[PDB]
Design a protein around this ligand. Structure first.
Ligand SMILES: [Zn+2]
Lengths: 323, 43, 905, 117
DNA sequence: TAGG
C-alpha cells in the first residue's frame, strides 16, 4: 500500500471525502496506521455522508442513528451538546438537532472500526431541510462526477534544438518558417532587414554554431536562407540599386496581368508554324521586356498560378497553348 | 448745349449710393429710411 | 445703365428726363460692375385673344433660349419664346388685355398644342397651400442663399426660381406682391416660423422700392451665390434640406473661412475637376438623406401641366442631422458634463465604502474618467478640425479659429497613425469619443460626508478625442528640382520624449548646451543616398549600418508618426552635399558611439509605402536584463505617481498574471489613451523585484507606449470559473480567481474593532486613544476580520474574509450585524481565538451549524500573482488520529481571500 | 441493521423484476387509501400506460393522506397469496414539487457508474 | 519603495 510518509501530500487526506456507504463499508484499513482507510490508494481519514434516518437509539450523552442512502446502512455516533439574540439562536441550533425516523441528516466524521463492524463518529451533524427532495437529488448527480475526476484518478526536436544541427543544415531549416510569415501577412515586398527584426525568426538564427561579430554573421544566415526561396522560385528582385529588396511572386498581380495579355495576340504571331506557343515563346518577350537575368524557376511558376482564369488548355507538360 | 450729368459720369463718380428728388425738399420716411440726398439731374 | 422702371408701358424708344432718380453702385461681390437705377415714378417726356391676367409665372427662363409663360382667363395659357421678353414687366395681374395675332403650335414633353406667339403686339410627409400674399421685407437672413424675412413672421426663400435681377432691389423696405406661393408650416430643421417660397409658376412682382441704403459689405455674408444655386438646380435638394444646408455652411464659416481658407474659395461652386471644399464637407450627410438619382426638374411641367413642383408641393419635416460645433464649445461643454456627473457617493457605494479610512476613501476619488459620445446627442454633433503637430511640445492636435483639442489617432484597430502627410489636412469624423479625465484633490473625513459640500480642494480636467482614421474623411486644404537628397531607413526603437542633457562639443572652449526637450530613434539604413529625379528618386550611391537620429528643437514635431517596423524616408533639401546622411548635438546617454546624426530643422520625413514581446519567463528572480516588453489590458488606474494594474495578453500562458506599472515625475503626464479597458502595448520597461518578491514595472526614458485599441462602450461580466479546490494544488496552469462551492469546517479567529478614520488607532467610545495627539473630527469606522477553514470534497483551504464580508459569512442580517457592531463600540477590541453577553454569543455562534454550513465561495489567491515562489521540499507534521502520533510530509496550506459569499440553495 | 433501500422504478416493480423480500425505494402518486385496513396504492406512468404499486401503511400508522401528490416509499417487498405483492413501508414521505424527470434521470447515472466498476 |  501507500507509505505513511506520503499520505499528507494527497489533498484528500485533509478533506471530508464524499463517498458512498457501499464504499465506506468496503474500504481496506491500513495496517500501518489504524483509523485510516485506503480507497484506490488515497488515504481516507474522514468522510461526509447524507442519508435517511432509519433508527434512533439514545444513550446518556450520545445518539446512535442508522443512516441509509440507498447504497448501504451505517451507524453514526453523534455526541450530545444581546441576550435576546443569543436565546433565539439556541432555539435554532436545537431544531437542527431534533432528529426522528425518516429525516434527512448530514454527518461529517471519521470511521472507527469495532471488530468487523464500522461506525462513523460525527464531529458535526444537523437535520437537512429537504421538502422537495432537491438536495438528495443533486447529490446523486454530483457523486459520479467527483469520483470519475478525482477519487478514481491515481495520485502522483531539431526545431526545438536548432543548436545541434549546424549551418549547412540550418538554412533549409529556417526558410520554411520564414515562408509562413509571408503567407497570411499579405506582404507584397519586403527588405532583408525587416525579417532580421522579427523575434520569431531571429531566435532561430543566432545559435551556438556561429561562435566562429555574431550580429554581422546573422546577416549571412538570412541572406543564404532568403536565396533558397529564390532558387526554388518564389521570391524575386529587379534591378533597382540595392540588393536587399525582394518581391513575392504569389502576391503581386501586375506581373500576372502581363502574363495574361500575351494570349491577346496568340503570343503575337500567326499559326502557320508549330501549333501554339512554347514555354520559351514567352521567354522571347519577357526577359527582353522586364529583366534579362530572369530565372527560369519563376517563368512557368506563374503559369502554375493563374490556371483557374480559364486561360489556355494545359494539355501536357513543356508546352504552352494558343486559343 | 453743355448737357447735364450723363450715364458715364454716374458710373465713374458718386459711388456712395446716392438718390435724388427734384420735386421739393422732403424727408420721405413713411415707415423707415435712413438717407442719401443729392441734387443731380439725369435725363 | 440698368433701368428698372416700375409699372412699365410701351414708351420704349422715347421718354427721357426722369426726375425721380436713385442710383446704387456695385456691391463689392460683383466683379462685372454694372450698378443700377431705381426710377420711382413716371417720367415726363390665327385669331386674337382677350381676358384677364391670372398667373404670369414670373419666370423668364434660361434653358437655351429665354421664354416665359402667361395664362389668361376670367383658362387659356400662352407661351412666348421670341425677343419680346420686355412684356414681362408691363403685365399686371387683374388688368384686361387685347393681345393679338396668336398661333397654335406643339411642344415637347406632352403634345397638347399650346398657344405660341409670333411677330405680335399687345393692347389694353406633409403638403403645402397656395397663398397670395403682399407684404414688406423687414430684414435679410442670407442674401446669397435667398432667405429674406418679411414682417415679424413668415420668412421667405427665393431660391427655387432663377433670381439674379432680384438680388439688386431687395433691401429692407421693399413691398412685394406674391401670387402663387407654396406655404410650408412645419418645415423644422432649426427653423420655427412658417416659410414662404415661390416656384416657376408664382409671380414675384414689386409694388414700391426701398428707401434705405444697403447696409455693409461684410465679406462674411456676401459670397457663395453660385454654390447655393448648385444645391437646387443640379444637386436637386428639397426645401427642408436646403435650409439645413445653408445653416451648416455658415456654421462652417465661423470655423474656417477667414483664416484656414478664404470666403471666396470655400463657397465657390464645383468645377469639373475637384473644387468646392464647402460641398465636399457636406456630402457625407447629403448622400444618405437625398441620394443621387432623381426625376429631373422639367421646365414646362411645373407651369402647364397638373402641379407637380420641385419638392415644395410635397415636403418632409426633417430634424437636424449634423450641427457642426466649434472646438471651443466641445471643450467647455465637455468639462461641464464632467463635474455635473461627478458624484462622490456613486463612485464609492454604500456597503463597501463604509469601512475605509480617510486616506483610502480619498485615494479612490482622485482619478476618474467618463466617455461622452457626441454622435448620440439631440443635434448629433460632428467633429472637424485641422490636424496640427506642435513644434514646441510634440503633441498632435485638431485646430480651428476658436481653440484646439488634443487628439489620439489610430489608423485601424491595432495599427498606429504613421503618415506624416496628414499635417495641415482637414479631418472630418462623425464616429468619435470625447474623453474627460477628472483629477480631484479631496479630504472627506468618512463615508457620511460624501454628499456634503466643502471637502474638495482642487479639481481639474483633461479633455481630448479618440477616433479611427477609417471612420473619418481627410481632405487637403487648397492653397490660394534636382536639389534634393534622400535615404531610407527601417525604424527599430523610439525613445521617450523628455528633457535631456547633452555632451559638450569637442575641441571648442568649454561650454555646455542647454538641456532641451528631445528624443531619438534607432534605425538602420537600407541603401545609399538617392537624388531627386523629376518626381521620383534615382539609384542609390554605393554603400554596421545602425544609426541614432537625434530630434530636438523644431524637429521634435515628428514624434507621433514614428513607429517600429515601418520604413520611412528622410528628405533633405538644398544642394547635393556628398557626405550628408553619414554623420555630422549628442545626448549624454549616447557617448562613445560615432553613429549619431542630428536631424536638421528643414528636413522632412515621409512614409515610404507585430511588435516585440518578452516571454512569460519575465517572472524570474535571477535576471540581468531589466528590460521587458509586453502587450496588456488596463484594469485600474490610481493616483498614488500613477499606478496602473494591467492584465497580460499572452497566447502561451493560459490565465496570465496581473502586474503593476508605476509612472513617476519625469514621465508623469502620461499618454492619452491609458484608460481602464484599453489594450496598450508597452515596450522597454524597468523590471524590478520588490522586497516581498513581487515583480513590477516602471517607466524609464525608453518606454514607447502605443495604444492598440480604445475601451469598449459596454462592459461585460465574463464571470469566474467553477474549479475544484484540489486543482489549485495538483498540476500547473491553474486560475487565481474562481468559485469552488465548499463547506465551512471551523473558525480560527474573529476581530471586531473600531478605528479612528484619520489614523488606524483604536477608539474606545469614539475617542482616539492613539497617544493624546490632535485630530479634527470625532469620527470612527468599524473593521472586521475572520479566518475560516472551508473545504471541498477534494481539498481544504484557509479563507480570510475582510470587513462587510464577515457578515454573510456568519449569516447575519444587516439589521442585526449593525446592532452587533455598536455593542463593541464601548469595548473597542473584541477578539476571539478559537464578557458575559458578548464572548458567549460569539462563541455559541461560531461553533453552531448555523455558521458551519455549505456555502458558495468566490475567492482569489492571496499570493499576489506577480510573486516569485521558490521550489522547496515538503515539511513534516504530526496528525495524531485516535491514539497514534505518526508523521507525514505536508505541502503548505492554501490561503485564499474572499470576494463574495453566497448560499447554496 | 436493515438492508439498504436501493432505488427502483415503479414499472420495474410492477412487472416482477425485483425479488420478494428485498428492500426498495420506489415512488408514485397517491390515489387510494384504506383507513380501516391500512393500504395505500401509488400510481405512475412509464411511457404510455399506468403502473401501480401496493403499500401497507401500517408502521407509520397515523397517516394524513395527501391524495394527488407524489410520495417516496421505503420498505421491504413482501408477497401475499397469489401475486399480491405489497410494500411493507417503513418510511413514507410526501414530496410535492419534486422534479420527477430529474429524479429518474439521476437513478440512471447512479446505475451507469456502478456498471463501470 | 511599491502588499501585508
Ligand atoms: Zn486618530
Amino acid at each position: 500500500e501507500t507509505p505513511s510518509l506520503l499520505w499528507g501530500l494527497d489533498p484528500v487526506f485533509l478533506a471530508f471525502a464524499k463517498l458512498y456507504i457501499r464504499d465506506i463499508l468496503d474500504m481496506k484499513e491500513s495496517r500501518q496506521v489504524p483509523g485510516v482507510f485506503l480507497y484506490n490508494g488515497h488515504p481516507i481519514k474522514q468522510v461526509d455522508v447524507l442519508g435517511t434516518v432509519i433508527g434512533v437509539r439514545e444513550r446518556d450523552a450520545f445518539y446512535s442513528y442508522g443512516v441509509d442512502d440507498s447504497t448501504g446502512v451505517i451507524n453514526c455516533i453523534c455526541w450530545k451538546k444581546l441576550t435576546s439574540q443569543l436565546k433565539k439562536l439556541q432555539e435554532t441550533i436545537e431544531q437542527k438537532t431534533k432528529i426522528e425516523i425518516g429525516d434527512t441528516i448530514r454527518v461529517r466524521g471519521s470511521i472507527r472500526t469495532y471488530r468487523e463492524e464500522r461506525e462513523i463518529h460525527a464531529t458535526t451533524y444537523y437535520k437537512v431541510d429537504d421538502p422537495v427532495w432537491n438536495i438528495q437529488i443533486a447529490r446523486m448527480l454530483e457523486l459520479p462526477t467527483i469520483y470519475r475526476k478525482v477519487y478514481d484518478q491515481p495520485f502522483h526536436e531539431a526545431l526545438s534544438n536548432p543548436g545541434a544541427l549546424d549551418l549547412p543544415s540550418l538554412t533549409s531549416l529556417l526558410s520554411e518558417k520564414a515562408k509562413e510569415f509571408l503567407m497570411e501577412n499579405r506582404v507584397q515586398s519586403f527588405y532583408q532587414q525587416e525579417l532580421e527584426m522579427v523575434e520569431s525568426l531571429l531566435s532561430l538564427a543566432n545559435q551556438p554554431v556561429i561562435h566562429s561579430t555574431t550580429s554581422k554573421a546573422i546577416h549571412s544566415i538570412f541572406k543564404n536562407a532568403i536565396q533558397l526561396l529564390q532558387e526554388k522560385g518564389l521570391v524575386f528582385q529587379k534591378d533597382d540599386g540595392f540588393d536587399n529588396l525582394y518581391y513575392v511572386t504569389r502576391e503581386d498581380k501586375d506581373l500576372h496581368r502581363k502574363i495574361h495579355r500575351i494570349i491577346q495576340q496568340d503570343c503575337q504571331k500567326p499559326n502557320h508554324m508549330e501549333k501554339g506557343c512554347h514555354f520559351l515563346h514567352i521567354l522571347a518577350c519577357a526577359r527582353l521586356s522586364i529583366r534579362p537575368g530572369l530565372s527560369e524557376a519563376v517563368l512557368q511558376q506563374v503559369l502554375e498560378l493563374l490556371e483557374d482564369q480559364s486561360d489556355i488548355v494545359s494539355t501536357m507538360e513543356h508546352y504552352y497553348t494558343a486559343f | 448745349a453743355i448737357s447735364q450729368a450723363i450715364i458715364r459720369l454716374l458710373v465713374e463718380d458718386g459711388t456712395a449710393e446716392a438718390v435724388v428728388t427734384c420735386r421739393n425738399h422732403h424727408v420721405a420716411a413713411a415707415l423707415g429710411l435712413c438717407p442719401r440726398e443729392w441734387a443731380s439731374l439725369l435725363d | 445703365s440698368c433701368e428698372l422702371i416700375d409699372l412699365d408701358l410701351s414708351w420704349l424708344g422715347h421718354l427721357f428726363l426722369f426726375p425721380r432718380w436713385s442710383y446704387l453702385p456695385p456691391a463689392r461681390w460683383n466683379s462685372s460692375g454694372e450698378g443700377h437705377l431705381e426710377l420711382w415714378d413716371a417720367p415726363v417726356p390665327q385669331r386674337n385673344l382677350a381676358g384677364s391676367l391670372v398667373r404670369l409665372s414670373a419666370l423668364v427662363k434660361s434653358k437655351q433660349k429665354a421664354y416665359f409663360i402667361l395664362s389668361l382667363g376670367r383658362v387659356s395659357i400662352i407661351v412666348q419664346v421670341p425677343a419680346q421678353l420686355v412684356w414681362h414687366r408691363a403685365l399686371r395681374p387683374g388688368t384686361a388685355y387685347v393681345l393679338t395675332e396668336l398661333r397654335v403650335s406643339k411642344i415637347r414633353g406632352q403634345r397638347q398644342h399650346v398657344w405660341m406667339t409670333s411677330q405680335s403686339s399687345r393692347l389694353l410627409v406633409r403638403y403645402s397651400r397656395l397663398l397670395s400674399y403682399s407684404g414688406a421685407v423687414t430684414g435679410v437672413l442670407n442674401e446669397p442663399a435667398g432667405l429674406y424675412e418679411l414682417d415679424g413672421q413668415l420668412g421667405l426663400c427665393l431660391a427655387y426660381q432663377q433670381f439674379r435681377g432680384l438680388r439688386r432691389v431687395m433691401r429692407p423696405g421693399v413691398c412685394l406682391q406674391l401670387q402663387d406661393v407654396h406655404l410650408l408650416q412645419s418645415v423644422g430643421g432649426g427653423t420655427r416660423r412658417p416659410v414662404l417660397a415661390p416656384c416657376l409658376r408664382g409671380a414675384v412682382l414689386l409694388q414700391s422700392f426701398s428707401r434705405q441704403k444697403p447696409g455693409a459689405h461684410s465679406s462674411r455674408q456676401a459670397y457663395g451665390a453660385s454654390l447655393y444655386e448648385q444645391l437646387v438646380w443640379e444637386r436637386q435638394l428639397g426645401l427642408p434640406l436646403y435650409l439645413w444646408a445653408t445653416k451648416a455652411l455658415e456654421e462652417l464659416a465661423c470655423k474656417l473661412c477667414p483664416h484656414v481658407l478664404r470666403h471666396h474659395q470655400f463657397l465657390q461652386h464645383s468645377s469639373p475637376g475637384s473644387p468646392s471644399l464647402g460641398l465636399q464637407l457636406l456630402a457625407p450627410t447629403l448622400d444618405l438623406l437625398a441620394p443621387p438619382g432623381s426625376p429631373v426638374r422639367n421646365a414646362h411641367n411645373e407651369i402647364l401641366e397638373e402641379p407637380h413642383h420641385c419638392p415644395l408641393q410635397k415636403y418632409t419635416r426633417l430634424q437636424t442631422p449634423s450641427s457642426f460645433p466649434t472646438l471651443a464649445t466641445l471643450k467647455e461643454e465637455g468639462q461641464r458634463k464632467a463635474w455635473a456627473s461627478f458624484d462622490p457617493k456613486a463612485l464609492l457605494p454604500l456597503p463597501e465604502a463604509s469601512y475605509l479610512p480617510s486616506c483610502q476613501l480619498n485615494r479612490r476619488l482622485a482619478w476618474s474618467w467618463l466617455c461622452l459620445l457626441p454622435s448620440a446627442f439631440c443635434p448629433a454633433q460632428v467633429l472637424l478640425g485641422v490636424l496640427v503637430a506642435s513644434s514646441h511640445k510634440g503633441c498632435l492636435q485638431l485646430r480651428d479659429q476658436s481653440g484646439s483639442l488634443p487628439c489620439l489617432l489610430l489608423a485601424k484597430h491595432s495599427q498606429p497613425l504613421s503618415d506624416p502627410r496628414l499635417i495641415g489636412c482637414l479631418v472630418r469624423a462623425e464616429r468619435f469619443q470625447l474623453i474627460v479625465e477628472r483629477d480631484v484633490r479631496s479630504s472627506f473625513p468618512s463615508w457620511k460626508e460624501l454628499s456634503m459640500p466643502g471637502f474638495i480642494q482642487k479639481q481639474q480636467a483633461r479633455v481630448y478625442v479618440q477616433f479611427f482614421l477609417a471612420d473619418a474623411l481627410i481632405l487637403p486644404v487648397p492653397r490660394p528640382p534636382h536639389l534634393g537628397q534622400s535615404r531610407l531607413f527601417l525604424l527599430c526603437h523610439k525613445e521617450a520624449l523628455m528633457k535631456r542633457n547633452f555632451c559638450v562639443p569637442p575641441g571648442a572652449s568649454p561650454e555646455v548646451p542647454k538641456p532641451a526637450l528631445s528624443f531619438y530613434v534607432l534605425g538602420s539604413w537600407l541603401g545609399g543616398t538617392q537624388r531627386k529625379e523629376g518626381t521620383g528618386w534615382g539609384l542609390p550611391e554605393p554603400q554596421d549600418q545602425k544609426v541614432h537620429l537625434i530630434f530636438f528643437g523644431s524637429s521634435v514635431r515628428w514624434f507621433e508618426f514614428l513607429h517600429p517596423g515601418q520604413v520611412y524616408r528622410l528628405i533633405a533639401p538644398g544642394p547635393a552635399t556628398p557626405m550628408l546622411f553619414e554623420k555630422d548635438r549628442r545626448p549624454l546617454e549616447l557617448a562613445g558611439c560615432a553613429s549619431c546624426l542630428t536631424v536638421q530643422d528643414n528636413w522632412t520625413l515621409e512614409l515610404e509605402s507585430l511588435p516585440e514581446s518578452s516571454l512569460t519567463d519575465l517572472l524570474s528572480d535571477n535576471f540581468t536584463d531589466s528590460l521587458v516588453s509586453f502587450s496588456a489590458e488596463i484594469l485600474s488606474r490610481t493616483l498614488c505617481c500613477v499606478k496602473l494594474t494591467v492584465a497580460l495578453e499572452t497566447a502561451e500562458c493560459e490565465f496570465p498574471p496581473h502586474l503593476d506599472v508605476y509612472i513617476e515625475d519625469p514621465h508623469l503626464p502620461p499618454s492619452l489613451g491609458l484608460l481602464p479597458g484599453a489594450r496598450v502595448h508597452f515596450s522597454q520597461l524597468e523590471k524590478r523585484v520588490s522586497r516581498s518578491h513581487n515583480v513590477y514595472c516602471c517607466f524609464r526614458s525608453s518606454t514607447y507606449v502605443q495604444v492598440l485599441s480604445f475601451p469598449p462602450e459596454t462592459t461585460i461580466s465574463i464571470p469566474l470559473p467553477h474549479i475544484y479546490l484540489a486543482e489549485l494544488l495538483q498540476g500547473g496552469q491553474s486560475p487565481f480567481q474562481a468559485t469552488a462551492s465548499c463547506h465551512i469546517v471551523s473558525v480560527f479567529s474573529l476581530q471586531l474593532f473600531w478605528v479612528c478614520a484619520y489614523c488606524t488607532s483604536i477608539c474606545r467610545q469614539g475617542k482616539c486613544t492613539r497617544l493624546g495627539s490632535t485630530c479634527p473630527t470625532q469620527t470612527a469606522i468599524s473593521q472586521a476580520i475572520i479566518r475560516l477553514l472551508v473545504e471541498d470534497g477534494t481539498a481544504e483551504a484557509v479563507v480570510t474574509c475582510r470587513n462587510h464580508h464577515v457578515a454573510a459569512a456568519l449569516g447575519l442580517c444587516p439589521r442585526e450585524w449593525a446592532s452587533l457592531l455598536d455593542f463593541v463600540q464601548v469595548p473597542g477590541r473584541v477578539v476571539l481565538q478559537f464578557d458575559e453577553p458578548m464572548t458567549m454569543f460569539l462563541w455559541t455562534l461560531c461553533t453552531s451549524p448555523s455558521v458551519l454550513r455549505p456555502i458558495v465561495l468566490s475567492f482569489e489567491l492571496e499570493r499576489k500573482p506577480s510573486k516569485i515562489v521558490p521550489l522547496e521540499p515538503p515539511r513534516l507534521q504530526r496528525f495524531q488520529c485516535g491514539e497514534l502520533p505518526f508523521l507525514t510530509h505536508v505541502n503548505p496550506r492554501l490561503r485564499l481571500s474572499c470576494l463574495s459569499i453566497r448560499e447554496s440553495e | 441493521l436493515p438492508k439498504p433501500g436501493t432505488y427502483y422504478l415503479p414499472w420495474e416493480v410492477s412487472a416482477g423484476q425485483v425479488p420478494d423480500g428485498s428492500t426498495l425505494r420506489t415512488f408514485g402518486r397517491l390515489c387510494l387509501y384504506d383507513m380501516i385496513q391500512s393500504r395505500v396504492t401509488l400510481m405512475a406512468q412509464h411511457g404510455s400506460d399506468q403502473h401501480q404499486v401496493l403499500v401497507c401503511t401500517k408502521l407509520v400508522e397515523p397517516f394524513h393522506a395527501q391524495v394527488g401528490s407524489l410520495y417516496i416509499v421505503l420498505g421491504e417487498l413482501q408477497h401475499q397469496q397469489d401475486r399480491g405483492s405489497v410494500v411493507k413501508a417503513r418510511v413514507l414521505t410526501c414530496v410535492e414539487g419534486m422534479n420527477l424527470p430529474l429524479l429518474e434521470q439521476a437513478i440512471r447515472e447512479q446505475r451507469l457508474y456502478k456498471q463501470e466498476r
